Amino acid sequence: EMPQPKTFGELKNLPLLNTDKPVQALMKIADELGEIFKFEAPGRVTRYLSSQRLIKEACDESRFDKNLSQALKFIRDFAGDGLATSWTHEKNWKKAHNILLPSFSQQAMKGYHAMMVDIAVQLVQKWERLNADEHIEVPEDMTRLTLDTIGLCGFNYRFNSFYRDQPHPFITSMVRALDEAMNKLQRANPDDPAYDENKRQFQEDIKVMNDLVDKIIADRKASGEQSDDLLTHMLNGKDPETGEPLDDENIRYQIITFLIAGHEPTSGLLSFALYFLVKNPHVLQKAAEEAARVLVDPVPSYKQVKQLKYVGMVLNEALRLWPTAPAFSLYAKEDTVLGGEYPLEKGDELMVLIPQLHRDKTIWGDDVEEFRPERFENPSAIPQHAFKPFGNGQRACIGQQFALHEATLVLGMMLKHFDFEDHTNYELDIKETLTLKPEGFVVKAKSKKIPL
Ligand code: HEM
Ligand SMILES: O=C(CCCCn1ccnc1)N[C@@H](Cc1ccccc1)C(=O)O
């Protein structure tokens, strides 16, 4: 009874994801098959959920817990039992959860703001300093910004991305390791000697990341500056339940986890937000008007960022259309029936296909493809589990407020400081990595010539 997309013999559905854009492939499948489809691969089955109707059940934490998708399982080879790749039942998940949640308290957020502004100003300055007719490589610069922000705010580490015309080596290795991790989904015989080089490159890339992590830790140890940041909590915070701090190994995984998680989807969000803004000039103008009205100081204060309501709406609407961490996986904690209709056995896996959730016309109306920030004029109007860019429940994104604050600040500053032109009439082309990004999205920015 459950729809299932086309199969490939013994490979079952797995070749469907042998594409550069698997999330978009799954969205198309969802478009065809509806709110739920079974997806089989050799030795694996999951069910992709796309309707709020079913996802609200899936989001019942008494019935389902976070599952490590194959992607996360393979990413776990270097993210280990960091927060994102740990099972809820692993001691280190709840420990690190409890230890690191304070890093995203309101007070923490205020504390990050200055460094977020530091990086944002670097972005603005970069764009201010472009010559006539030069253009902005949007995902690239958003990723420079987000990486630097998480590095600086989180770890008091400067990736100095705006000093580089190429991504920081960490990124290069992180991108290749993520990609290798996700390529393993397709690999029938992962121990085939043909993948020895992939294994070597994987370890080399993991070593690059870990070397940077070791440097972040050593620099913090050696530091004479007082820090009270995410790393501080990693190195010193004690879990109230266990009384225990994170052990060294987990700290390292958390650093890797947060460097990755703390920058990748946010960069996508910013990129998509700017994409949608330049595609929707009335929206852009409204957002710009808000930025101009609110950001009355040379650098935004924390409170001003919080007053960028419409910018927040823009970001939420971008997350609605292109949630940059576009899926998460769940497993049935016990036998349960989904939707009154689909019996699941304990351990059965679900995938929540967030972009498709966000296109559930029964929630959003028929105009789901339109970019309408006003959908979020009162976010509380959105039904529960209808809008899930940050995942669910206690396994939701710990960094959501950081992401949104950063993105609101940055977008606000961008909108305050520049007019943007979609000079190429850019054709959305969504590159799928760990996140989604509008690949090749370029704009031209005309400074409003507002000093910092
Ligand atoms: C707009 C940007 C972001 C989006 C869309 C996003 C999305 C998500 C989603 C969907 C999950 C759940 C994944 C799952 O259940 O498998 C998640 C978890 C997580 N995110 Fe984010 N995220 C963003 C930014 C960030 C930031 C800025 C940080 C850290 C500073 C971060 C750190 C994490 C961590 C550590 C987890 C795992 C939480 C846990 O399981 O304990 N993310 N994110
Ligand atoms: O589920 C995840 C992993 C989601 C990670 C989201 N994310 C980002 C940051 N934090 C969490 N991919 C999806 C889509 C997919 C399928 C095959 C190959 C690659 C991708 C799936 O396997 O169905």
UniProtKB/Swiss-Prot annotation:
Induction: By pentobarbital. Expression is negatively regulated by repressor bm3R1 at the transcriptional level. It comes from Priestia megaterium (strain ATCC 14581 / DSM 32 / CCUG 1817 / JCM 2506 / NBRC 15308 / NCIMB 9376 / NCTC 10342 / NRRL B-14308 / VKM B-512 / Ford 19). Changing A261C: No effective fatty acid oxidation. No effect on electron transport from NADPH to FMN. Residues 1-452 are annotated as: Cytochrome P450. Functions as a fatty acid monooxygenase. Catalyzes hydroxylation of fatty acids at omega-1, omega-2 and omega-3 positions. Shows activity toward medium and long-chain fatty acids, with optimum chain lengths of 12, 14 and 16 carbons (lauric, myristic, and palmitic acids). Able to metabolize some of these primary metabolites to secondary and tertiary products. Marginal activity towards short chain lengths of 8-10 carbons. Hydroxylates highly branched fatty acids, which play an essential role in membrane fluidity regulation. The record marks P265 as: Important for catalytic activity. Changing A71G: Higher activity in the hydroxylation of highly branched fatty acids. Changing A261Q: No effective fatty acid oxidation. No effect on electron transport from NADPH to FMN. Nearly wild-type level of high-spin conversion with laurate/dodecanoate, palmitoleate and arachidonate. The chain holds residues 5 to 456 of 1049 of the full protein. Changing L185Q: Higher activity in the hydroxylation of highly branched fatty acids. (9Z)-hexadecenoate binds at Y48. Changing A79I: No effect in binding affinity for laurate as substrate. High coupling of NADPH consumption to laurate formation. No indole hydroxylation. Favors omega-2 hydroxylation. Changing L83E: Ineffective covalent modification of the heme macrocycle. Extensive formation of Fe(II)CO complex in the substrate-free form. Heme binds at C397. This protein is a target of protein engineering. Its selectivity-directing and activity-enhancing mutations have been extensively studied and the designed mutations allow this enzyme to act on non-native substrates and/or in order to enhance production of synthetically desirable end-products. Changing F390W: Large decrease in the heme reduction potential in the presence and absence of substrate arachidonate. 10% reduction in efficiency to couple NADPH consumption to substrate monooxygenation. This is Bifunctional cytochrome P450/NADPH--P450 reductase. It is found in: Cytoplasm. In the N-terminal section; belongs to the cytochrome P450 family.
